[PDB]
Enzyme design. Structure first.
Site, PDB file in Angstrom:
ATOM      1  N   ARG A 100     -10.209 -40.016   8.100  1.00 56.37           N
ATOM      2  CA  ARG A 100      -9.067 -40.914   8.123  1.00 56.37           C
ATOM      3  C   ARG A 100      -9.456 -42.362   7.901  1.00 56.37           C
ATOM      4  NH1 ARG A 100      -5.490 -38.351  13.146  1.00 56.37           N
ATOM      5  NH2 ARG A 100      -5.778 -36.189  12.477  1.00 56.37           N
ATOM      6  N   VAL A 101     -10.551 -42.598   7.188  1.00 58.55           N
ATOM      7  CA  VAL A 101     -11.006 -43.932   6.834  1.00 58.55           C
ATOM      8  C   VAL A 101     -11.070 -44.006   5.318  1.00 58.55           C
ATOM      9  CG1 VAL A 101     -12.856 -45.606   7.084  1.00 58.55           C
ATOM     10  CG2 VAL A 101     -12.271 -44.116   8.976  1.00 58.55           C
TER      11      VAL A 101
END
Lengths: 160, 280, 123, 49, 66, 253, 123, 140, 123
Positions: free
Chosen positions: B106-107
Site C-alpha cells: 500500500r505504498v
C-alpha cells in the site's frame, strides 16, 4: 506394448449384396428394384414389372432377366411401372444403374424426387436464368447455364 | 517477527490461566490491540525526529491457505501490505512462492527507486495482461502474444534462492520488458541471466564498443539508482550491451544447447539450469 | 532436482483430478494425458511392500537403496520408461523389479489369448 | 516423436502457462482477444480507406 | 463442354442436384433437400501453432481446383 | 471454518449449475439424435452393391506397405466433445498401424490438435462441416478432391459404426487406387470367378460389363462409388457422435 | 432505465460465464454474444483512474460528469459503440477519452505489423 | 413487521445481559416461543367472535440466501406459508423478485375468489411447465 | 417374495423409463415392454380410494385384506391377469373389484359404438 488391441471391421461386410449367378434355371416374372439417393433409400427391393431409364446414349427399357449391363444415367427423369399397371416417375441427378441377370436392379443416384413435387411455375423462371448464363460469355457461368438447362429441358418437356 | 501466531498462543495461555474471559478462537478478545501496539510503532520518523525508521516484516503461519482465521485478519487489518506465499506454487516448483494476486503493498512507487518505478510499472501492465491469458495452454506457439513470452521469462527471473543486487536485478528485467529476451526459450532464461551478470560476453568475444557500461564493475548500481535507466547517458549503452549479449548467446550457446540429444549431456545441462536458478 | 520435478508433476496431476473426476481422461490434451499417464505411474511406484506387512500385500518386502531410488525416478521423469504399463509399478521396489513384473504380466496376458484360442477352437 | 510435453526441463517444450491464472475465465479471454484484434485490423483499413 | 473445363463429374452431379432442389415445391421435402445442397463446411490446416484455411480446393462448384 | 464453509458453498452451487448445463447438452443432443435415428430404419442399402467392386480379401498390412509408396488414412472426427473414446481410439489405431509411408487428411477439429501432436509430419490437414445443414454428396466429393491431391495407393477410411445406442465400434473402408483397381479388374475378369475369401460376393460378370463401359465413365464409376463410401462413413460417425455423447454425458452427470 | 438495464445485463453476463467456462462461446446465439461483449465492456468501462492512485496506476485521474456518464453508458447499451474495442474502455473516464485510446491502440498495432514486415525485409 | 430478525437481536441482548442461559446463535431457548407468542395471535376468527381477522406479513432478512438460519427455520416452522424474494431476479428486471417454487401458501384456494381459482390454477399449470422447459433450454 | 418382485419390477421400470424418454418404447425388447405394461398396471393398482373422502369426492372406499392383496399382486405378477387394461386398476381395491370396472368400461365403449353405429346408420 500391446499387439494390436484394435481390429476394425470391414464396413463393406455389413451390407448384403447380390450373388451374381450365371443361371441354371428360369427367370423371375418381376424385377426386384432397389433405388437409392445419397444415403437413404426410397425403394428397398420392391417387386416391379418394368422400368425405363434415361442415359447419355439415350433411353432404355428394363424387363425381367434383362442383360447384365451398367452405364451412366443422364440427368433427367425416370419411369417405373409396377405389376398393377400403375406408374411412378422420379426426377434424378445422374448415377449408375446395375441390372442383374437374376432380376435385381440396383440404382444409385445423388437425388430422387417425384414429378409431383415440382411445379412448372418455379421451373419457368430458372430457364431464362440458365439461358442468360449460357449466353453470357464466361467459362464459369456458361457451363452453369448449360447444365441447369440439361436438367430443366426434360422436365419442361415431361410436364408438357 | 517470526511467527506472531506463536505470540498469540502465549497471550492466550497467560490470560486464560489468569482467569480472563475467553473470546473468539479462545483468545481473550484484545489480541488485536496487542499487535496494534506492536506494529504501529513502525514508522518513518519525521526529520524533526532524525529521519529514522524501522521496517517490520511480521510473519503469520497459515493453515490450508485460508485468510479467515482470527489473528490473520487481525494482522492484515494492521499491516500495510502482505506477501502471500502459496503452497500450491511452492509445491508447484517456483520459489519464492509469491502469489501476486493476493500480495500487494500500500505504498507502491513512492517506496521503490526511480530506476525501478519505470520497470515495475511495466511489469504491472505486463502481468495484468499475462494474468488474463496464461491460463491458456499455448496453442499459437508462433502466434503467441509478446505478453505470453515476456511474462513467462519474467516468471523464470522471479525464481531465486538468495537476494539479488539491485544492478543485477533490473538489467535482467529490462530485457524482458523490452523484448531482447524473446528468441531464447523459457528454460534458458536464467543461464542467460547468469552470463548477463557474472560472465560478460562482449568483454570476452571482443565486442567492446561500450565506453563504460559493463556488469563486471558492480559500482554502476549507484549511477543507475541516481540517474535511472531511462536516461540519455545510460539507455543507449544499455541496449548496446544487451543486444550483443543476446546475439552471442543465441549464436554460440543456445545453438549448442539445442544440439544435445544424449541423456548424459542433457542431464548435465539440466542440473546446470537448476544451479542457475538457485545462485542467481 | 528430481524430487522437485516429481512434486511438480503431482501438483499438476492434482489440478487435473478436478477434470478427470468430472469429464474423463478423454477430454484432455495429448500433453496433459501424458502427464496423467506418467503421474499415475509415479504414484503407483511410490508404493512398495514392507517385510512387516507381508500378511496384507502377500509379498516379500524390498529395501530400495538411495542411489537406486533416484535413477528410477529420473528414468520415469524423462520419459525413459513409458512403454511399461501403469500396474507394473504397483507394489514393487526398484525399476528392475518392475521389468520383471511387466514380463510376468505380458506372459500371463498373452497366455490368456492362446488359452482362449484353444477354448474357442474346442468350442 | 510421441509428444513433446512441456516441462521445467530443457528438452521438454516451453510452458507459458501460469498457475496464478485461472482456467475458468480463459475461454472468454480468448474470444475477447480474437475479436479485439479483428476490430483493430479493420480499423487500420478504415483509416487507410 | 464442361468436361475439358476442368471440373469433376461429382461437382457436375451436385450442380444438377442444386438446380433440382431449387425448382421443386415448398414443403417438408424441400426442407430436407435444401440441407443436402447448402455449403457451410470449410478446410483447415495447422500452422506451427495457428489455424489456416487450405484454400486450394474451394467448396463452391463454379470454381475449379488448381 | 468460515472460509471453509464458503468454499464448499461455492463448490456446491457451482456443481448444481454445472449439472443442468450438462443436462442441456443432453437435451440438445437428443434433439439432434432423434432426427438421425430415422436413418437407422433406412440403413445399409446405398453401398449394398458398391462393396462388390471395391471389396477384396483382407490383405495384410506389412505386405501392402511393401507394394505401395504412399498410403492414406482418413479418420472421421468430431467438432465438439463430450463424446467418448471415439476420436481417441481413432488415434490409437493409427499409432497402432503407423508406418513410414502414410498421410492423414482427417475430418473434424479434434484430429487437428491431436494428430499434429502425435503425428507431426504425416498429418496434413482436415475438413470441417459445421452441422447446421445435413451432409451432402458434394461434401464427400469435396473430400475426394483433397485425397486426389496425393498419388496415394490405398485409402483406408476410418469411422465409427453405430451398431446400437450402446455400441459404436470402428469400421474401415480399404479403397484401392484407380490405376490399381482397373488392373485388378481386368486380371480378375480374365480368369474363372472363384471367391478368394469367406463372406465375399462373386463379381465376375460386373468386371466384364465394366470392361464394356468406356474410359471416362469408369473413371466416374470409381469416383462415384468412392464418394458414396465416404458419405456413409460421415453419416455413421454423425449418428455415433450423437449416440456416444449421450452416454459420455450421463456418466458425467 | 440505463442503470437498471446495465444491472439486468450483468446478471445475464454472470449466467454466461457459467456456460462459457463449460461449453464455449460458440454455444451461444449471436444476440447473446452481443450482450456478453457489452457487459464485458461495461465492466471494464466502469473502471476509472483516480488522482489519488497516481502512485499505483501511474496515470492521471479523470473527473466524469453525471450528464456525460449517461450518454456513454446508454450509447454502449444500444450498440452505439460496438465497433470500438474492449481494452479502450479499460481505465479511462468518459467516452471521448476512449476514442483517443482506441486510435492509439490502432497506431501501436500498426507499428508492430509494419515492424514485423521490416523484420521480414531485413531477414 | 419490518422486521423480526432485529427483534430477535433485541431479545438476545436482553436475555444475555440479564444472564439468561444462551443457546444456538447465542439466543435463548424460548425465542421460538417468542415469535409463537406473536404470530399465533393472528387468526381468522369465528362467527361467534365477530368474524374478524388479523393477518400477518412478518419480514425476515436472510444473508447469502441462507434458510438454515435459526430464526428463519423457526418462522418457517410457524408460518402458514412463505414468500421468498431473490436478488438474482431483482437485478434481472424481475420485480417483485419472487422464487415461486420456494414461495408457498398452504392456503392455496380457500382464500382465492371464484374468478381467481380458475385463473391461478391455470397459471400453476403454466409455470410448473415453463420451468421444466426454461431450465433445460439453452442460452440461445 | 411377491413384494420383492414388485420392487424389482418397479425399479426396472424406472430404468426403462429413463430409456423410453431417450430412445422410445419401440427400442425395447418384447420382454421389457411387458413389464413396462405391468409396472404401470401395478403403480395404477396402488392407487386406492378412501371411505374418509367418500362424501367429498363421492367414490366408495375399499378395505382390502392382506392375503387377498397378495394373491392379487401375484396374479398381476404371474401374468395371469394381463388382458385387463391399465386404467381399470386406477382407484380400485382388490382384484375382485376391478373386474366390475373392466366390464363397465367395455360395456360403456360398446354402448358408444352401438350409439355411433346406429346414429350414423340412421342418417
Amino acid at each position: 506394448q500391446d499387439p494390436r488391441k484394435f481390429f476394425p471391421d470391414n464396413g463393406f461386410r455389413f451390407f448384403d449384396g447380390p450373388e451374381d449367378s450365371f443361371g441354371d434355371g428360369n427367370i423371375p416374372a418381376q424385377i426386384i428394384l432397389t433405388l437409392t439417393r445419397q444415403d437413404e433409400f426410397i425403394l428397398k427391393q420392391e417387386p416391379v414389372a418394368a422400368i425405363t431409364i434415361r442415359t447419355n446414349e439415350g433411353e432404355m427399357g428394363v424387363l425381367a432377366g434383362h442383360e447384365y449391363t451398367v452405364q451412366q444415367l443422364a440427368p433427367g427423369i425416370l419411369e417405373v411401372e409396377y405389376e398393377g399397371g400403375k406408374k411412378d416417375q422420379y426426377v434424378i441427378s445422374g448415377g449408375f444403374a446395375h441390372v442383374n441377370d437374376t432380376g435385381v436392379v440396383d440404382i444409385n443416384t445423388v437425388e430422387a424426387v417425384p414429378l409431383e413435387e415440382i411445379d412448372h411455375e418455379k421451373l419457368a423462371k430458372a430457364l431464362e436464368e440458365a439461358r442468360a448464363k449460357s449466353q453470357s460469355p464466361d467459362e464459369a457461368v456458361r457451363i452453369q447455364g448449360e447444365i441447369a438447362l440439361e436438367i430443366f429441358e426434360p422436365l419442361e418437356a415431361a410436364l408438357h | 517477527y517470526d511467527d506472531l501466531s506463536k505470540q498469540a498462543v502465549s497471550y492466550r495461555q497467560i490470560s486464560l490461566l489468569l482467569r480472563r474471559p475467553p473470546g473468539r478462537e479462545a483468545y481473550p478478545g484484545d489480541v488485536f490491540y496487542l499487535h496494534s501496539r506492536l506494529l504501529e510503532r513502525s514508522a518513518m520518523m519525521s526529520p524533526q525526529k532524525g529521519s529514522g525508521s524501522l521496517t517490520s516484516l511480521p510473519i503469520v503461519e497459515t493453515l490450508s491457505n485460508d485468510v479467515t482465521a482470527y489473528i490473520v485478519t487481525n494482522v492484515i487489518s494492521i499491516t500495510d501490505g502482505q506477501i502471500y506465499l502459496d503452497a500450491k506454487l511452492f509445491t508447484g516448483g517456483q520459489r519464492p512462492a509469491v502469489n501476486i494476486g493476493l500480495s500487494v503493498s500500500r505504498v507502491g512507487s513512492s517506496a521503490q527507486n526511480k530506476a525501478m518505478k519505470k520497470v515495475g510499472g511495466a511489469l504491472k501492465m505486463l502481468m495484468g495482461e499475462y494474468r488474463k491469458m496464461a491460463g491458456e495452454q499455448t496453442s499459437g506457439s508462433q502466434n503467441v502474444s509478446p505478453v505470453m513470452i515476456r511474462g513467462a521469462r519474467c516468471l523464470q527471473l522471479f525464481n531465486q534462492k538468495g537476494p539479488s543486487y539491485f544492478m543485477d536485478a533490473i538489467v535482467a528485467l529490462y530485457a524482458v520488458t523490452n523484448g531482447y529476451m524473446d528468441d531464447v526459450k523459457l528454460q534458458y532464461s536464467k543461464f542467460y541471466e547468469f552470463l548477463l551478470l557474472n560472465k560478460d560476453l562482449p568483454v570476452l568475444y571482443g565486442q567492446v564498443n561500450n565506453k563504460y557500461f559493463y556488469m563486471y564493475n558492480k559500482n554502476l548500481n549507484y549511477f543507475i539508482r541516481y540517474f535511472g535507466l531511462n536516461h540519455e547517458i545510460l539507455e543507449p549503452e544499455l541496449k548496446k550491451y544487451i543486444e550483443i549479449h543476446t546475439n552471442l548467446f543465441l549464436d554460440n550457446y543456445q545453438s549448442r544447447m539445442n544440439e544435445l540429444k544424449s541423456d548424459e549431456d542433457l542431464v548435465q545441462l539440466k542440473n546446470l539450469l537448476y544451479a542457475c536458478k538457485r545462485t542467481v | 532436482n528430481v524430487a522437485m520435478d516429481i512434486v511438480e508433476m503431482l501438483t499438476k496431476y492434482k489440478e487435473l483430478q478436478d477434470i478427470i473426476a468430472v469429464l474423463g481422461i478423454d477430454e484432455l490434451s495429448e500433453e496433459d494425458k501424458l502427464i496423467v499417464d506418467r503421474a499415475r505411474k509415479v504414484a503407483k511406484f511410490m508404493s512398495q511392500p514392507f517385510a512387516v506387512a507381508e500378511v496384507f500385500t502377500g509379498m516379500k518386502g524390498y529395501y530400495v537403496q538411495l542411489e537406486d531410488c533416484v535413477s528410477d525416478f529420473g528414468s520415469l521423469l524423462m520419459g525413459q520408461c513409458d512403454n511399461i504399463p501403469e500396474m507394473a509399478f504397483y507394489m514393487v521396489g526398484g525399476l528392475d523389479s518392475v521389468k520383471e513384473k511387466a514380463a510376468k504380466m505380458a506372459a500371463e496376458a498373452a497366455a490368456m489369448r492362446e488359452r482362449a484360442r484353444k477354448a474357442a477352437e474346442a468350442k | 516423436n510421441k509428444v513433446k510435453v512441456p516441462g521445467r526441463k530443457p528438452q521438454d517444450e516451453e510452458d507459458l502457462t501460469w498457475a496464478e491464472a485461472d482456467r475458468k475465465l480463459t475461454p472468454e479471454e480468448r474470444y475477447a482477444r480474437d475479436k479485439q484484434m479483428a476490430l483493430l485490423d479493420k480499423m487500420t483499413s478504415q483509416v487507410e480507406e | 463442354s464442361w468436361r475439358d473445363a476442368g471440373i469433376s463429374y461429382l461437382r457436375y452431379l451436385s450442380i444438377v442436384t442444386r438446380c433440382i432442389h431449387e425448382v421443386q415445391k415448398e414443403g417438408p421435402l424441400l426442407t430436407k433437400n435444401v440441407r443436402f445442397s447448402t455449403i457451410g463446411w470449410k478446410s483447415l490446416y495447422l500452422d506451427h501453432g495457428a489455424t489456416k484455411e487450405y484454400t486450394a480446393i474451394p467448396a463452391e462448384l463454379e470454381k475449379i481446383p488448381e | 471454518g468460515g472460509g471453509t464453509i464458503r468454499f464448499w458453498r461455492e463448490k456446491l452451487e457451482g456443481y448444481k449449475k454445472y449439472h443442468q448445463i450438462v443436462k442441456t447438452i443432453k437435451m440438445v443432443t437428443l434433439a439432434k439424435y432423434r432426427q438421425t435415428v430415422v436413418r437407422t430404419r433406412v440403413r445399409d442399402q446405398t453401398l449394398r452393391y458398391t462393396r462388390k467392386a471395391l471389396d477384396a480379401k483382407t490383405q495384410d498390412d506389412q505386405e501392402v506397405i511393401e507394394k505401395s509408396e504412399c498410403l492414406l488414412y482418413v479418420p472421421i472426427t468430431t467438432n465438439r466433445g463430450s463424446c467418448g473414446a471415439l476420436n481417441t481410439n481413432m488415434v490409437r489405431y493409427l499409432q497402432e498401424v503407423e508406418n513410414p509411408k502414410m498421410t492423414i487428411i482427417s475430418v473434424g477439429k479434434k484430429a487437428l490438435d491431436a494428430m499434429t501432436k502425435v503425428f507431426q509430419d504425416t498429418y496434413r490437414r482436415t475438413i470441417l462441416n459445421d452441422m447446421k445443414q445435413a451432409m451432402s454428396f458434394q461434401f464427400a466429393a469435396y473430400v475426394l478432391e483433397h485425397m486426389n491431391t496425393v498419388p496415394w495407393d490405398r485409402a483406408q477410411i476410418v469411422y465409427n459404426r453405430y451398431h446400437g445406442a450402446a455400441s459404436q465400434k470402428l469400421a474401415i473402408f480399404n479403397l484401392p487406387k484407380f490405376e490399381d483397381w482397373k488392373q485388378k479388374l481386368e486380371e480378375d475378369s480374365a480368369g474363372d470367378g472363384k471367391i478368394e475369401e469367406d463372406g465375399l460376393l462373386q463379381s465376375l460378370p460386373m468386371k466384364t460389363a465394366l470392361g464394356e463401359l468406356e474410359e471416362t465413365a469408369v473413371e466416374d464409376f470409381y469416383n462415384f462409388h468412392s464418394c458414396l463410401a465416404v458419405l456413409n462413413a460421415v453419416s455413421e460417425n454423425e449418428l455415433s457422435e450423437y449416440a456416444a455423447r449421450i452416454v459420455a454425458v450421463e456418466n458425467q452427470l
